[PDB]
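Ticket #305: bound-state structure for 6-nitrobenzotriazole.
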Amino acid sequence: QSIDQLIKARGKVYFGVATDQNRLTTGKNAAIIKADFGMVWPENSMKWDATEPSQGNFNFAGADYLVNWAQQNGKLIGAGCLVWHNFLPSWVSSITDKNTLINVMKNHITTLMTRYKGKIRTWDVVGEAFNEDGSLRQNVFLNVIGEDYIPIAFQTARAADPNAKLYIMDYNLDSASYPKTQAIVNRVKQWRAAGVPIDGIGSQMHLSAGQGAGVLQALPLLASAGTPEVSILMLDVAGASPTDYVNVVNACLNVQSCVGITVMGVADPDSAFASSTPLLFDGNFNPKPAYNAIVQDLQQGSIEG
Ligand SMILES: O=[N+]([O-])c1ccc2nn[nH]c2c1
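RESOLUTION: The complex was predicted; output attached.
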């Protein structure tokens, strides 16, 4: 059974997966994605160091392949991350002039979003902007531009493609009592109050065993920022326990504004954390216990009021 179909039947938008051209042309990835997933994200091909490796020199072959494959196969597309300290070329992080960095950031945003205008459901505009203690991360953007870089990025994105849902994403938002979780909620509330167009918070859920249960409290806390959407991104779970995975899925189901879940890949050998066997399919492309547990969970209705 298809977990995407099953989650749609429970009123959600999608169950998605990260992929790219290499995956689609090897293994059984394309067959599994066609059958079982409803949204794709580029694993690597939309990163800044993939797409703009030197100034104004855009590389779109990989991203184009994924977007076209998704279109041809009737899948939604998410993409990102546009402004991120990760995977950022040294030509960017060496800029010291404020107006230059502002325009470099804006052109990166606008060029990527314009190319795919109208085709992308969700853009992750700003990623990993917070320190663990909840203060803003001192990346090049914060150091050179200051905290206005976040509002500027979102407004620029809204202008470039008003159809897209614009997200901020971060990791270690998996515990309701952790400082980072409350801090992103607080900052997003105040950005939105000031007119900054943040449509979603995406929680990047690279989990260790046993962390699924806590998401049942963290995800509702994230939703309390009042964004129209929240989502689960980059999901994998060390050990791939059915209990962890079912708890994450149920957190999504419990949170009205949660639109869906994206897993970080299809099969274990293709994970960056392969030795932790953290995905839903094994090295034979058979569904693992966790996949089947999710299927059982989604088939079984809850008693609603
Ligand atoms: O959910 N995802 O797996 C995922 C992968 C790569 C991304 N880049 N920006 N957002 C992303 C989400």
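RESOLUTION NOTES: The first helix runs from residue 3 to 9.
TICKET STATUS: resolved
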